[PDB]
């Protein structure tokens, strides 16, 4: 029976997560064990680098976060959530946190390296994803949220930049810096302007339904090639989101539009994923009728785009960024803040 099988899978996943959540993993490694190769991404309090583990020769993506910038930007709790969630979760479309540690200047989160690059680059390069192509990716995010939401985890940062393509052409979700365990409501104003549900913008306490709104935004952006509420300044992006007036390209199928109308629903009593039938309102929608949910999960489905790779530590699928030095101070910084890391 396919129904019992989902619940038994979800029960077990919860058990595994909760064990790992109560008995973690910490001081797994040291910086000196890694050779820095190349910057894969930049940010306001950190960067992500390709490193090689010298004992094994294996490559990893090492997220490096400046402790003082984390404190200033009010991301201590968020940074601690990220490591704690990432060590505890296990799902095919989530990046794998292999090592974590800290020194006097920084926090280190060492993930398995996903060499296919961001979905962002691929999407900007080709214009838009045709509907079957978008649907393949959207099916993976749907399963991913069902898994996280079952564990009471809200993701809160969905966007093409956080969706990395692996060698098989499947997605790995990276960046859990806004992810949070919440059984009911939460109140932090965070996310990416284009992807924010109206309820976040309006300073209302909100739930996991913001993830399903952002799924709507992602799906529109994959199939159109640009997001449904765009402006040059965030302030006008917010105004657009809150009315919820969305226009669809003439090439969008009726099924797609009907789906996106139900995700991009300003009214919480009406937004798919938030109704009584949960995630099944999305999985059983007509736009997904050709989707074999199990085969996606098992990665049996042939991906419509497989990345090019020249062996371990190839970075041809990533853009180039200015290389800066990793400084490690002689004096411990922000020790009490990060004593739990
Ligand atoms: N040019 C700049 N300096 N600014 C660009 C900002 C980029 C980014 N980060 C930040 O500013 C702030 C967060 C505040 C913004 N709010 C949101 N979270 N939406 N974050 C920070 O400062 C933390 C450092 C960067 C982490 C995110 N990047 C990433 O995570 C990228 O690194 C690669 N990457 C990550 N994991 C992997 C992996 N496992 N394998 C391969 N590549 C990876 C992949 O290219 C991702 O797009 C953001 N806006 O989300
Ligand atoms: N069939 C496929 N699977 N793919 C092929 C589709 C190619 C097709 N274009 C489109 O479908 C899409 C692809 C959108 C994403 N564009 C890029 N990534 N560069 N384009 C279209 O259908 C026309 C754009 C209408 C959007 C409104 N914006 C605008 O009026 C201006 O902003 C820029 N613009 C819009 N969106 C984007 C974006 N996502 N990135 C960069 N620039 C953009 C653009 O140059 C305009 O002058 C086309 N023939 O141009």
What is the per-residue DSSP string for 25-42?
Answer: ------GGGEEEEEEEEE
Say yes or no: CB of residue 46 within 6 Å of ligand 1: yes
Which of these, 228, 231, 225, 291, lies nearest to 263 by C-alpha position? 228
Does 42 appear as a known binding residue?
Answer: yes
Ligand nearest to the CA of 44: 1
Distance of CA 46 to the CA centre of its chain: 17
32 is catalytic: no
Task: Give, for 51, the enclosing helix (H) or strand (E).
Answer: strand 46-53
> Cα(117)–Cα(63) distance, rounded to whole angstroms?
15
Per DSSP, the three-state class of 111 is strand
The answer to whether residues 177 and 187 touch, using CB atoms and an 8 Å cutoff, is no
Phi-psi region of 169 (alpha: psi -120 to 50; beta: other; left: phi over 0): left
Catalytic residue chosen out of the listed positions 16, 32, 152, 157: 157
Structure tokens at 248: 């669809």
Q: Which residues pair with 97 in a beta bridge?
A: 111
Q: How many angstroms does the Cα of residue 20 sit away from the middle of ligand 1? A: 26
> Cα(264)–Cα(218) distance, rounded to whole angstroms?
11
CATH class of 6-23+118-308: mainly alpha
Structure tokens at 6: 């989902």
Residues of the chain with CATH 1.10.510.10: 6-23+118-308
Q: How many angstroms does the Cα of residue 162 sit away from the middle of ligand 1? A: 7
Does 44 appear as a known binding residue?
Answer: yes
Structure tokens at 61: 């993506």
Structure tokens at 215: 């799924």
DSSP output for 195-253: G--HHHHTT--B-THHHHHHHHHHHHHHHHSS-SS--SSHHHHHHHHHH------TTS-
Q: Which residues pair with 111 in a beta bridge?
A: 61, 97
Q: How many angstroms does the Cα of residue 174 sit away from the middle of ligand 1? A: 9
Does 63 appear as a known binding residue?
Answer: yes
Q: Give every strand in the sheet of 59-66, ordered side by side.
A: 34-42, 46-53, 59-66, 106-112, 97-102
Ligand nearest to the CA of 221: 2
Does 291 appear as a known binding residue?
Answer: no
Q: How many angstroms does the Cα of residue 154 sit away from the middle of ligand 2? A: 31
By CB atoms closer than 10 A (0-12, 13-18, 19+), residue 129 is buried
Buried b or exposed e, range 205-226, using 16+ CB within 10 angstroms: ebbbbbbbbbbbbbbbbbbbee
Residues of the chain with CATH 3.30.200.20: 24-117+309-339
Q: What is the DSSP letter of 135?
A: H
By CB atoms closer than 10 A (0-12, 13-18, 19+), residue 6 is middle
Q: What is the DSSP letter of 44?
A: S
Q: Give the mutation target among 37, 38, 39, 44 for probing the ligand 1 site: most ligand atoms within 8 A of CB.
A: 44
Resolution of the model in angstroms: 2.3
- Angle made by CA atoms 102, 107, 110, in degrees to the nearest 5: 95
Per DSSP, the three-state class of 280 is helix
Which of these, 157, 126, 155, lies nearest to 43 by C-alpha position? 157
Say yes or no: CB of residue 70 within 6 Å of ligand 1: no
For the structural domain made of 24-117+309-339, what CATH number should be given? 3.30.200.20
Please give the backbone phi and psi of residue 235, each rounded to the nearest 5 degrees, phi first.
Answer: -50, -45
The answer to whether residues 317 and 305 touch, using CB atoms and an 8 Å cutoff, is no
> Cα(159)–Cα(1) distance, rounded to whole angstroms?
34
Structure tokens at 122: 């691929």
Ligand 2 pocket (Cβ < 6 Å) reads 124, 126-128, 130, 225-226
Q: What is the DSSP letter of 193?
A: G
C-alpha Rg value of the chain to the nearest Å: 20
Say yes or no: CB of residue 193 within 6 Å of ligand 1: no
> Cα(117)–Cα(161) distance, rounded to whole angstroms?
9
E-strand ranges in 59-170 read: 59-66, 97-102, 106-112, 153-154, 163-165
Q: Which single residue is written with the structure tokens 């806004």?
A: 178
Q: How many CB atoms lie within 10 A of CB 233?
A: 9
Which of these, 116, 86, 83, lies nearest to 101 by C-alpha position? 83
């Amino acid at each position: 029976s396919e129904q019992e099988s989902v619940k038994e899978f979800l029960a077990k996943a919860k058990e595994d997560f909760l064990k790992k959540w109560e008995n973690p993993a910490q001081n797994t490694a040291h910086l000196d064990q890694f050779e820095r190769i190349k910057t894969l991404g930049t940010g306001s309090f950190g960067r992500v680098m390709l490193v090689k583990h010298m004992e094994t020769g294996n490559h990893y993506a090492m997220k490096i976060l400046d402790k003082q910038k984390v404190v200033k930007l009010k991301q201590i709790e968020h940074t601690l959530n990220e490591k704690r969630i990432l060590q505890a979760v296990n799902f095919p479309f989530l990046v794998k946190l292999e090592f974590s540690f800290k020194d006097n200047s920084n926090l280190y989160m060492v993930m398995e390296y996903v060499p296919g690059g961001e979905m962002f680059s691929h999407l900007r390069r080709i214009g838009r994803f045709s509907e079957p192509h978008a649907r393949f990716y959207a099916a993976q995010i749907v399963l991913t949220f069902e898994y996280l939401h079952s564990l009471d985890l809200i993701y809160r940062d969905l966007k093409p930049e956080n969706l990395l393509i692996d060698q098989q052409g499947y997605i790995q979700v990276t960046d859990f810096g806004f992810a949070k365990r919440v059984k009911g409501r939460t109140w932090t104003l965070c996310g990416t302007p284009e992807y924010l549900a109206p309820e976040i913008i309006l300073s209302k306490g909100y739930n996991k339904a913001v993830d399903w709104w952002a799924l709507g935004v992602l799906i529109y952006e994959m199939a159109a090639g640009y997001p449904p509420f765009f402006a040059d300044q965030p302030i006008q992006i917010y105004e657009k989101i809150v009315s919820g007036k969305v226009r669809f390209p003439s090439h969008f199928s009726s099924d797609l539009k009907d789906l996106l109308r139900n995700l991009l629903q300003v009214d919480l009593t009406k937004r798919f994923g938030n109704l009584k039938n949960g995630v099944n309102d999305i999985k059983n929608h007509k736009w997904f009728a050709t989707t074999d949910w199990i085969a996606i999960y098992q990665r049996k489905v042939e991906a419509p785009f497989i990345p090019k790779f020249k062996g371990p530590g190839d970075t041809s699928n990533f853009d180039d960024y200015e290389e800066e030095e990793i400084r490690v101070s002689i004096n411990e910084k922000c020790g009490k803040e990060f004593s739990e890391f």
